[PDB]
């Protein structure tokens, strides 16, 4: 259903709201009308390493099979998790980079429009001059 | 979890407007439209579209759908019937873009 606060939104309370704002600026339904407050190089050098280790574990997992394999698969799990950590470090950085790209594109577009109209105007002027050079 | 807060209650309620069937259930009523209370509440919930209240909105649709309904309550069954078909056309594309 709908929240209970809706029962405090009558036209009379809306008529009493401005003076309650001016009075409170200097507990009730009019407080229900007031909105609530707001609550209170890099990793690329390691990724390679991790990658190189992953294969090295896979070989082990191949070379075991016996009941020893279990122990090995544990280590493998840890490696994969590490990979995920570094990618987490790539989540916000790439976002900012994307913003950069967008802005640059905007700049280029801006100049392109003007350039188009410019060349058109030039052509027009030349054409008229030609006609002039044929009469006198 | 402990007792809720009016901020989270109004936040989850305005965020519930992103669902189409829920808005359909809210509009296909007969009691909440006899008195000018639910309309003034929806028009009151327009503070989430402005910062810093917009920093907690997870679904961008619920806000704009709210502005549509607040845009429609100013000026019965038929139009209420009219909106969901169109929004239905819109949904799946965004769903494809999400995941």
């Amino acid at each position: 259903t709908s929240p209970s606060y809706v029962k405090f939104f009558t036209q009379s309370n809306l008529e009493k709201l401005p003076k309650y704002k001016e009075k409170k600026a200097a507990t009730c339904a009019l407080d229900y009308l007031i909105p609530p407050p707001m609550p209170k190089q890099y990793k690329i050098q390691e990724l390679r390493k991790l990658l190189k280790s992953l294969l090295l574990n896979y070989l082990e997992l191949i070379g075991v099979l016996p009941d020893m394999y279990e122990r090995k698969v544990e280590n493998i799990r840890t490696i994969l998790v590490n990979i995920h950590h570094l990618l987490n470090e790539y989540r916000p950085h790439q976002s900012r980079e994307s913003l950069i790209m967008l802005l640059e594109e905007q700049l280029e577009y801006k100049r392109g429009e003007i350039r188009e109209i410019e060349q058109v105007c030039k052509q027009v002027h030349d054409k008229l001059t030609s006609i002039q050079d044929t009469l006198r | 979890n402990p007792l809720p807060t009016r901020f989270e209650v109004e936040l989850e309620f305005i965020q519930s407007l992103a669902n189409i069937q829920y808005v359909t259930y809210l509009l296909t009523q007969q009691q909440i439209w006899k008195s000018p209370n639910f309309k003034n509440y929806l028009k009151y919930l327009e503070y989430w579209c402005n910062p810093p209240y917009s920093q907690c909105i997870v679904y961008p649709n619920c806000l704009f759908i709210l502005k549509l309904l607040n845009g429609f309550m100013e000026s019965x069954x038929x139009x209420x019937x009219x909106x969901x078909x169109x929004x239905x056309x819109x949904x799946x594309x965004x769903x494809x873009x999400x995941x």
């Binding site: 259903t1 709908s2 929240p3 209970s4 | 809720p4 989270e8 209650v9 989850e12 309620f13 519930s16 669902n19 069937q21 829920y22």
Partner: peptide
């Protein structure tokens, strides 16, 4: 419709 009944909309619209 599950996040409303499992969240806070059910209880907030029920305690009154």
């Amino acid at each position: 419709e599950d996040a409303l009944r499992r969240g806070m909309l059910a209880m907030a619209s029920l305690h009154s």
